[PDB]
PDB file of C-alpha atoms in Angstrom:
ATOM      1  CA  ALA A   1      23.706   6.984  39.529  1.00 18.24           C
ATOM      2  CA  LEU A   2      22.880   8.048  36.057  1.00 16.50           C
ATOM      3  CA  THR A   3      26.082   8.729  34.150  1.00 14.95           C
ATOM      4  CA  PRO A   4      25.754  10.227  30.699  1.00 13.90           C
ATOM      5  CA  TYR A   5      28.350   8.612  28.462  1.00 14.15           C
ATOM      6  CA  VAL A   6      31.330  10.831  27.745  1.00 14.93           C
ATOM      7  CA  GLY A   7      34.295  10.161  25.425  1.00 13.45           C
ATOM      8  CA  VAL A   8      35.532  10.081  21.910  1.00 14.90           C
ATOM      9  CA  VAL A   9      34.465   7.221  19.716  1.00 16.35           C
ATOM     10  CA  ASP A  10      35.587   6.781  16.232  1.00 17.32           C
ATOM     11  CA  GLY A  11      33.071   5.413  13.657  1.00 20.28           C
ATOM     12  CA  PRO A  12      31.705   6.001  10.182  1.00 21.93           C
ATOM     13  CA  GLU A  13      30.989   9.515   9.082  1.00 24.36           C
ATOM     14  CA  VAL A  14      27.581  10.804   9.819  1.00 24.51           C
ATOM     15  CA  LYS A  15      26.386  13.374   7.287  1.00 28.39           C
ATOM     16  CA  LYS A  16      24.906  16.425   8.944  1.00 28.07           C
ATOM     17  CA  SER A  17      21.563  18.235   8.159  1.00 32.67           C
ATOM     18  CA  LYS A  18      21.854  21.809   6.694  1.00 32.27           C
ATOM     19  CA  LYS A  19      18.376  22.663   7.892  1.00 33.84           C
ATOM     20  CA  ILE A  20      15.543  21.629  10.042  1.00 30.31           C
ATOM     21  CA  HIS A  21      13.596  18.944   7.871  1.00 28.63           C
ATOM     22  CA  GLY A  22       9.853  19.260   8.001  1.00 29.17           C
ATOM     23  CA  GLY A  23       8.830  16.731   5.226  1.00 29.86           C
ATOM     24  CA  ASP A  24       7.319  19.605   3.254  1.00 31.04           C
ATOM     25  CA  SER A  25       4.633  16.846   2.522  1.00 29.13           C
ATOM     26  CA  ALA A  26       2.176  18.865   4.616  1.00 27.54           C
ATOM     27  CA  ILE A  27      -0.665  16.602   5.761  1.00 24.26           C
ATOM     28  CA  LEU A  28       1.217  14.829   8.454  1.00 25.25           C
ATOM     29  CA  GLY A  29       3.116  16.735  11.209  1.00 28.32           C
ATOM     30  CA  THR A  30       6.817  16.600  12.367  1.00 27.16           C
ATOM     31  CA  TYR A  31       8.206  15.838  15.850  1.00 28.54           C
ATOM     32  CA  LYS A  32      10.131  18.761  17.070  1.00 28.15           C
ATOM     33  CA  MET A  33      13.765  18.098  16.744  1.00 24.98           C
ATOM     34  CA  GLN A  34      15.669  21.466  16.982  1.00 26.53           C
ATOM     35  CA  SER A  35      16.980  21.990  20.547  1.00 29.19           C
ATOM     36  CA  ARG A  36      20.710  22.129  20.885  1.00 25.63           C
ATOM     37  CA  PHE A  37      21.364  20.086  23.930  1.00 27.36           C
ATOM     38  CA  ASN A  38      18.184  18.177  24.420  1.00 26.17           C
ATOM     39  CA  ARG A  39      17.911  16.388  20.838  1.00 22.84           C
ATOM     40  CA  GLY A  40      17.509  12.937  22.403  1.00 22.36           C
ATOM     41  CA  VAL A  41      18.101  10.450  25.128  1.00 25.60           C
ATOM     42  CA  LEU A  42      19.306   6.863  24.342  1.00 23.97           C
ATOM     43  CA  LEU A  43      18.926   4.032  26.772  1.00 26.57           C
ATOM     44  CA  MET A  44      21.344   1.299  25.543  1.00 29.75           C
ATOM     45  CA  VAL A  45      21.230  -2.087  27.169  1.00 32.37           C
ATOM     46  CA  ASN A  46      23.507  -4.764  25.790  1.00 31.64           C
ATOM     47  CA  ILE A  47      23.305  -7.981  27.798  1.00 32.67           C
ATOM     48  CA  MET A  48      25.994 -10.513  26.770  1.00 35.63           C
ATOM     49  CA  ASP A  49      26.497 -12.890  29.632  1.00 36.37           C
ATOM     50  CA  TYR A  50      24.092 -15.681  30.722  1.00 39.94           C
ATOM     51  CA  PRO A  51      24.157 -18.865  33.093  1.00 38.13           C
ATOM     52  CA  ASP A  52      27.220 -20.211  31.361  1.00 40.54           C
ATOM     53  CA  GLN A  53      29.802 -19.019  28.753  1.00 41.33           C
ATOM     54  CA  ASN A  54      27.851 -20.830  26.059  1.00 41.53           C
ATOM     55  CA  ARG A  55      25.201 -18.370  24.926  1.00 38.61           C
ATOM     56  CA  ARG A  56      27.769 -15.631  25.287  1.00 38.65           C
ATOM     57  CA  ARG A  57      26.934 -13.158  22.587  1.00 42.66           C
ATOM     58  CA  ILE A  58      30.378 -12.602  21.122  1.00 41.55           C
ATOM     59  CA  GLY A  59      30.659  -9.552  18.976  1.00 43.30           C
ATOM     60  CA  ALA A  60      28.011  -7.677  20.889  1.00 42.02           C
ATOM     61  CA  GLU A  61      30.309  -4.959  22.214  1.00 40.84           C
ATOM     62  CA  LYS A  62      30.758  -4.178  18.405  1.00 42.94           C
ATOM     63  CA  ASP A  63      27.235  -3.108  18.505  1.00 39.85           C
ATOM     64  CA  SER A  64      27.504  -1.001  21.533  1.00 41.54           C
ATOM     65  CA  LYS A  65      30.275   0.951  19.865  1.00 40.49           C
ATOM     66  CA  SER A  66      28.288   1.497  16.628  1.00 40.58           C
ATOM     67  CA  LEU A  67      25.141   2.737  18.513  1.00 37.78           C
ATOM     68  CA  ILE A  68      27.150   4.936  20.789  1.00 37.37           C
ATOM     69  CA  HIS A  69      29.087   6.516  17.980  1.00 37.77           C
ATOM     70  CA  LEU A  70      25.929   7.029  15.935  1.00 35.83           C
ATOM     71  CA  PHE A  71      24.015   8.602  18.647  1.00 41.13           C
ATOM     72  CA  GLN A  72      26.879  10.958  19.768  1.00 38.22           C
ATOM     73  CA  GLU A  73      26.786  12.344  16.210  1.00 36.27           C
ATOM     74  CA  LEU A  74      23.004  12.786  16.569  1.00 38.27           C
ATOM     75  CA  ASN A  75      23.848  14.712  19.847  1.00 38.34           C
ATOM     76  CA  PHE A  76      21.952  12.386  22.105  1.00 41.42           C
ATOM     77  CA  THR A  77      22.579  12.026  25.773  1.00 39.94           C
ATOM     78  CA  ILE A  78      23.401   8.292  26.182  1.00 35.68           C
ATOM     79  CA  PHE A  79      22.979   5.905  29.078  1.00 37.47           C
ATOM     80  CA  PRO A  80      24.728   2.606  28.227  1.00 35.92           C
ATOM     81  CA  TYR A  81      24.685  -0.573  30.220  1.00 35.34           C
ATOM     82  CA  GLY A  82      26.051  -3.995  29.998  1.00 33.53           C
ATOM     83  CA  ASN A  83      24.765  -7.054  31.881  1.00 34.62           C
ATOM     84  CA  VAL A  84      21.775  -6.472  34.128  1.00 33.27           C
ATOM     85  CA  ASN A  85      19.162  -8.638  35.754  1.00 33.92           C
ATOM     86  CA  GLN A  86      15.292  -8.352  35.434  1.00 33.70           C
ATOM     87  CA  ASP A  87      15.294  -6.268  38.524  1.00 31.66           C
ATOM     88  CA  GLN A  88      18.139  -3.905  37.735  1.00 31.79           C
ATOM     89  CA  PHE A  89      16.666  -3.423  34.222  1.00 32.44           C
ATOM     90  CA  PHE A  90      13.383  -2.053  35.328  1.00 30.19           C
ATOM     91  CA  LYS A  91      15.061   0.048  37.967  1.00 32.68           C
ATOM     92  CA  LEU A  92      17.351   1.720  35.252  1.00 30.50           C
ATOM     93  CA  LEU A  93      14.463   2.302  32.989  1.00 32.80           C
ATOM     94  CA  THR A  94      12.418   3.985  35.634  1.00 33.16           C
ATOM     95  CA  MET A  95      15.393   6.106  36.645  1.00 35.28           C
ATOM     96  CA  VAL A  96      16.016   7.081  33.000  1.00 35.40           C
ATOM     97  CA  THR A  97      12.354   7.924  32.026  1.00 32.95           C
ATOM     98  CA  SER A  98      11.890   9.860  35.337  1.00 32.90           C
ATOM     99  CA  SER A  99      15.157  11.677  34.787  1.00 26.66           C
ATOM    100  CA  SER A 100      15.482  15.414  34.454  1.00 25.75           C
ATOM    101  CA  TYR A 101      17.341  14.486  31.202  1.00 25.17           C
ATOM    102  CA  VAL A 102      14.220  12.871  29.564  1.00 22.71           C
ATOM    103  CA  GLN A 103      11.843  15.484  31.050  1.00 24.52           C
ATOM    104  CA  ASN A 104      13.314  18.019  28.646  1.00 24.82           C
ATOM    105  CA  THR A 105      14.443  15.708  25.782  1.00 22.71           C
ATOM    106  CA  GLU A 106      12.908  15.988  22.391  1.00 20.93           C
ATOM    107  CA  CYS A 107      13.085  12.262  21.647  1.00 21.41           C
ATOM    108  CA  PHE A 108      13.562   8.885  23.379  1.00 19.62           C
ATOM    109  CA  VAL A 109      15.313   5.820  21.940  1.00 19.17           C
ATOM    110  CA  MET A 110      15.935   2.581  23.837  1.00 16.43           C
ATOM    111  CA  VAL A 111      17.881  -0.263  22.452  1.00 16.79           C
ATOM    112  CA  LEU A 112      17.726  -3.610  24.256  1.00 16.72           C
ATOM    113  CA  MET A 113      20.023  -6.238  22.938  1.00 17.45           C
ATOM    114  CA  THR A 114      19.713  -9.679  24.589  1.00 17.80           C
ATOM    115  CA  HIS A 115      18.146 -13.110  23.812  1.00 20.16           C
ATOM    116  CA  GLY A 116      14.358 -13.550  23.121  1.00 18.26           C
ATOM    117  CA  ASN A 117      11.952 -16.384  23.662  1.00 15.57           C
ATOM    118  CA  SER A 118       8.507 -17.148  22.288  1.00 16.71           C
ATOM    119  CA  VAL A 119       6.819 -18.904  25.225  1.00 16.57           C
ATOM    120  CA  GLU A 120       3.146 -19.841  24.054  1.00 16.34           C
ATOM    121  CA  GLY A 121       1.608 -16.837  22.285  1.00 17.90           C
ATOM    122  CA  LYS A 122       3.719 -14.661  24.401  1.00 19.46           C
ATOM    123  CA  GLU A 123       7.024 -12.936  23.806  1.00 16.75           C
ATOM    124  CA  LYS A 124       9.861 -12.857  26.493  1.00 13.29           C
ATOM    125  CA  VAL A 125      13.226 -11.346  27.083  1.00 14.77           C
ATOM    126  CA  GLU A 126      16.283 -12.749  28.881  1.00 15.76           C
ATOM    127  CA  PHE A 127      18.664 -10.964  31.362  1.00 17.89           C
ATOM    128  CA  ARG A 128      22.009 -11.726  32.928  1.00 18.79           C
ATOM    129  CA  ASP A 129      20.441 -13.919  35.694  1.00 18.85           C
ATOM    130  CA  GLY A 130      18.672 -15.876  33.090  1.00 19.02           C
ATOM    131  CA  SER A 131      15.358 -14.619  34.215  1.00 21.14           C
ATOM    132  CA  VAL A 132      12.652 -13.691  31.673  1.00 21.92           C
ATOM    133  CA  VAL A 133       9.847 -10.974  31.250  1.00 24.49           C
ATOM    134  CA  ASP A 134       6.860 -10.459  29.048  1.00 27.88           C
ATOM    135  CA  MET A 135       8.026  -7.876  26.431  1.00 33.00           C
ATOM    136  CA  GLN A 136       4.596  -6.540  26.943  1.00 35.54           C
ATOM    137  CA  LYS A 137       5.661  -5.544  30.503  1.00 35.69           C
ATOM    138  CA  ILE A 138       8.577  -3.557  28.999  1.00 36.76           C
ATOM    139  CA  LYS A 139       6.297  -1.763  26.451  1.00 39.16           C
ATOM    140  CA  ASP A 140       3.798  -0.972  29.084  1.00 43.89           C
ATOM    141  CA  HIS A 141       6.298   0.946  30.904  1.00 42.31           C
ATOM    142  CA  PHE A 142       5.831   3.675  28.307  1.00 45.14           C
ATOM    143  CA  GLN A 143       2.145   4.188  28.905  1.00 45.01           C
ATOM    144  CA  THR A 144       1.454   7.904  29.525  1.00 44.81           C
ATOM    145  CA  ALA A 145       0.699   7.248  33.182  1.00 46.17           C
ATOM    146  CA  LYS A 146       4.245   5.882  33.878  1.00 50.98           C
ATOM    147  CA  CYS A 147       6.076   8.178  31.380  1.00 52.81           C
ATOM    148  CA  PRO A 148       4.704  11.633  31.894  1.00 52.74           C
ATOM    149  CA  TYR A 149       7.786  13.049  30.338  1.00 52.30           C
ATOM    150  CA  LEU A 150       7.342  11.276  27.062  1.00 59.03           C
ATOM    151  CA  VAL A 151       3.647  12.092  26.412  1.00 59.74           C
ATOM    152  CA  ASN A 152       3.425  13.418  22.720  1.00 58.90           C
ATOM    153  CA  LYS A 153       7.141  12.763  22.269  1.00 54.12           C
ATOM    154  CA  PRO A 154       8.798  10.350  19.735  1.00 52.82           C
ATOM    155  CA  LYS A 155       9.491   6.971  21.360  1.00 50.60           C
ATOM    156  CA  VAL A 156      11.603   4.461  19.519  1.00 51.93           C
ATOM    157  CA  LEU A 157      11.908   0.994  21.325  1.00 48.32           C
ATOM    158  CA  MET A 158      14.368  -1.364  19.617  1.00 52.03           C
ATOM    159  CA  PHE A 159      14.709  -5.053  20.199  1.00 54.99           C
ATOM    160  CA  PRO A 160      17.101  -6.172  17.389  1.00 52.56           C
ATOM    161  CA  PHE A 161      17.074  -9.698  18.956  1.00 50.02           C
ATOM    162  CA  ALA A 162      13.563 -11.039  19.149  1.00 50.88           C
ATOM    163  CA  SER A 163     -14.019  -2.698  29.121  1.00 46.03           C
ATOM    164  CA  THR A 164     -11.008  -3.979  31.051  1.00 47.75           C
ATOM    165  CA  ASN A 165      -8.192  -3.648  28.461  1.00 45.34           C
ATOM    166  CA  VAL A 166      -5.265  -1.645  29.757  1.00 45.13           C
ATOM    167  CA  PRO A 167      -4.355   1.707  27.759  1.00 44.92           C
ATOM    168  CA  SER A 168      -2.232   1.845  24.602  1.00 43.58           C
ATOM    169  CA  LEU A 169       0.902   3.599  23.514  1.00 40.58           C
ATOM    170  CA  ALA A 170       1.202   6.634  21.381  1.00 42.32           C
ATOM    171  CA  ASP A 171       3.996   8.307  19.457  1.00 39.36           C
ATOM    172  CA  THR A 172       5.793   4.870  19.605  1.00 36.58           C
ATOM    173  CA  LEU A 173       7.762   2.672  17.211  1.00 33.68           C
ATOM    174  CA  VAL A 174       8.662  -0.797  18.225  1.00 33.27           C
ATOM    175  CA  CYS A 175      11.533  -2.142  16.007  1.00 36.03           C
ATOM    176  CA  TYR A 176      12.425  -5.784  15.606  1.00 35.83           C
ATOM    177  CA  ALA A 177      15.023  -7.783  13.591  1.00 39.69           C
ATOM    178  CA  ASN A 178      12.329 -10.294  12.517  1.00 43.76           C
ATOM    179  CA  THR A 179      14.183 -13.494  11.702  1.00 47.88           C
ATOM    180  CA  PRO A 180      14.093 -16.874  13.269  1.00 44.73           C
ATOM    181  CA  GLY A 181      17.658 -17.122  12.306  1.00 47.63           C
ATOM    182  CA  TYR A 182      20.576 -16.173  14.461  1.00 50.56           C
ATOM    183  CA  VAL A 183      23.806 -17.265  12.611  1.00 50.62           C
ATOM    184  CA  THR A 184      24.958 -14.848   9.993  1.00 49.12           C
ATOM    185  CA  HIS A 185      27.998 -13.356   8.161  1.00 48.79           C
ATOM    186  CA  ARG A 186      29.795 -16.569   9.322  1.00 48.29           C
ATOM    187  CA  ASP A 187      30.693 -14.861  12.623  1.00 48.96           C
ATOM    188  CA  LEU A 188      27.543 -12.703  13.633  1.00 49.93           C
ATOM    189  CA  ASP A 189      23.822 -12.789  14.572  1.00 49.99           C
ATOM    190  CA  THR A 190      20.747 -11.350  12.685  1.00 51.67           C
ATOM    191  CA  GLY A 191      20.195  -8.643  15.234  1.00 51.60           C
ATOM    192  CA  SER A 192      23.792  -7.514  15.046  1.00 50.30           C
ATOM    193  CA  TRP A 193      23.566  -7.375  11.285  1.00 53.61           C
ATOM    194  CA  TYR A 194      20.160  -5.450  11.680  1.00 50.67           C
ATOM    195  CA  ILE A 195      21.883  -3.064  14.112  1.00 46.54           C
ATOM    196  CA  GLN A 196      24.970  -2.518  11.915  1.00 47.66           C
ATOM    197  CA  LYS A 197      22.938  -1.943   8.771  1.00 49.16           C
ATOM    198  CA  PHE A 198      20.747   0.434  10.816  1.00 47.65           C
ATOM    199  CA  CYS A 199      23.758   2.473  11.947  1.00 45.51           C
ATOM    200  CA  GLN A 200      25.023   2.534   8.257  1.00 45.86           C
ATOM    201  CA  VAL A 201      21.749   3.693   6.855  1.00 50.61           C
ATOM    202  CA  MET A 202      21.393   6.139   9.717  1.00 49.55           C
ATOM    203  CA  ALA A 203      24.903   7.583   9.082  1.00 52.00           C
ATOM    204  CA  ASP A 204      24.194   8.085   5.353  1.00 52.58           C
ATOM    205  CA  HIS A 205      20.544   9.224   5.484  1.00 53.13           C
ATOM    206  CA  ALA A 206      19.669  10.675   8.865  1.00 54.56           C
ATOM    207  CA  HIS A 207      20.460  14.114   7.593  1.00 53.11           C
ATOM    208  CA  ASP A 208      17.775  13.797   4.930  1.00 51.93           C
ATOM    209  CA  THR A 209      15.278  11.026   5.650  1.00 52.46           C
ATOM    210  CA  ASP A 210      12.645  10.352   8.356  1.00 53.37           C
ATOM    211  CA  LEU A 211      13.032   7.375  10.714  1.00 54.82           C
ATOM    212  CA  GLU A 212      10.344   5.225   9.091  1.00 53.63           C
ATOM    213  CA  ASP A 213      11.961   5.592   5.723  1.00 54.82           C
ATOM    214  CA  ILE A 214      15.241   4.550   7.358  1.00 53.30           C
ATOM    215  CA  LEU A 215      13.774   1.504   8.960  1.00 56.88           C
ATOM    216  CA  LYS A 216      12.274   0.260   5.666  1.00 58.75           C
ATOM    217  CA  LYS A 217      15.739   0.982   4.089  1.00 57.35           C
ATOM    218  CA  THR A 218      17.284  -0.986   7.024  1.00 55.47           C
ATOM    219  CA  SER A 219      14.763  -3.815   6.591  1.00 55.60           C
ATOM    220  CA  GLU A 220      15.280  -3.933   2.793  1.00 52.90           C
ATOM    221  CA  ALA A 221      19.071  -3.870   3.240  1.00 52.31           C
ATOM    222  CA  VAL A 222      19.394  -6.486   6.042  1.00 49.70           C
ATOM    223  CA  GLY A 223      16.941  -8.639   3.932  1.00 50.45           C
ATOM    224  CA  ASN A 224      18.833  -8.608   0.547  1.00 50.17           C
ATOM    225  CA  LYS A 225      21.703 -10.927   1.577  1.00 50.71           C
ATOM    226  CA  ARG A 226      22.445 -14.336   2.781  1.00 49.83           C
ATOM    227  CA  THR A 227      21.355 -16.889   5.524  1.00 49.22           C
ATOM    228  CA  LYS A 228      18.002 -15.148   6.130  1.00 47.48           C
ATOM    229  CA  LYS A 229      16.393 -14.510   2.820  1.00 46.18           C
ATOM    230  CA  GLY A 230      13.778 -17.215   2.745  1.00 43.02           C
ATOM    231  CA  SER A 231      10.287 -15.832   3.383  1.00 43.56           C
ATOM    232  CA  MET A 232      11.380 -12.569   1.954  1.00 43.48           C
ATOM    233  CA  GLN A 233      12.796  -9.670   3.989  1.00 46.93           C
ATOM    234  CA  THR A 234      13.518  -9.480   7.655  1.00 48.40           C
ATOM    235  CA  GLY A 235      13.248  -6.193   9.438  1.00 49.62           C
ATOM    236  CA  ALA A 236       9.934  -5.028  10.923  1.00 51.94           C
ATOM    237  CA  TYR A 237       8.406  -2.490  13.352  1.00 51.06           C
ATOM    238  CA  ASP A 238       5.045  -1.575  14.700  1.00 47.95           C
ATOM    239  CA  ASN A 239       3.671   1.953  14.343  1.00 45.70           C
ATOM    240  CA  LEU A 240       1.708   2.763  17.531  1.00 44.38           C
ATOM    241  CA  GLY A 241       0.070   6.068  16.847  1.00 43.52           C
ATOM    242  CA  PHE A 242       3.550   7.232  15.643  1.00 48.91           C
ATOM    243  CA  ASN A 243       1.811   9.670  13.369  1.00 49.14           C
ATOM    244  CA  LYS A 244       4.352  12.445  12.530  1.00 52.70           C
ATOM    245  CA  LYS A 245       7.618  12.229  10.677  1.00 53.84           C
ATOM    246  CA  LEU A 246      10.775  11.930  12.658  1.00 51.62           C
ATOM    247  CA  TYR A 247      13.728  13.785  11.234  1.00 53.07           C
ATOM    248  CA  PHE A 248      16.814  13.676  13.478  1.00 53.26           C
ATOM    249  CA  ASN A 249      18.377  16.780  11.872  1.00 52.73           C
ATOM    250  CA  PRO A 250      21.804  15.576  13.084  1.00 51.43           C
ATOM    251  CA  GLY A 251      24.360  18.480  13.446  1.00 53.85           C
ATOM    252  CA  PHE A 252      21.748  21.316  13.111  1.00 51.76           C
ATOM    253  CA  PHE A 253      19.611  23.387  15.487  1.00 53.13           C
ATOM    254  CA  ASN A 254      16.976  26.043  15.519  1.00 54.02           C
TER     255      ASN A 254
END
């Protein structure tokens, strides 16, 4: 049932690399990003319909287009989805991470766009059916045990709209659009602005700069603006043993 996205999508110009970037810094390594058909896999899930046409995230499809366009230029294999329930979501995820596609891919990026709740000290995520799940559940899916195919591979999990301790993640980045705000640009949401700025920054710098630099640029950018510049800055991410640089080397292979 896995259908890689195919089709022409117009969007900003994404500068291309002219070499395989390796930081040159030398001290920290670089995730391999040089294959020509297995550069990366993107799992994009944009949920935009809930119990009633009230919380309907209008303008969300605009994000799907930006992300798809951007990752097509990064030469990723893309698996995009619309509204799905808690049960469908976890089935898709498993199907994707267990896919022959991911088995040989050099990089994995998932972007889940939905509504998020902060029940107690826990963080939850909503789906089409209105149901919720501990984001922890979602992250845990990427433990080496469950994702054999991603061990030692760059994993970027993005949620733009946010003696008995179980194992931890490695080579993983968890990105958020950290803002207790939702209305922005008179007709948008903070996550959508985060996403747009992200794609813009990716488009202009992916050819030259590693992901973590881009995320800081994204966070600085989305921050310096209106209706969300109170406690200073907005974007944020967790580095879970993501100890090497991640250059996407768009448009170039070795």
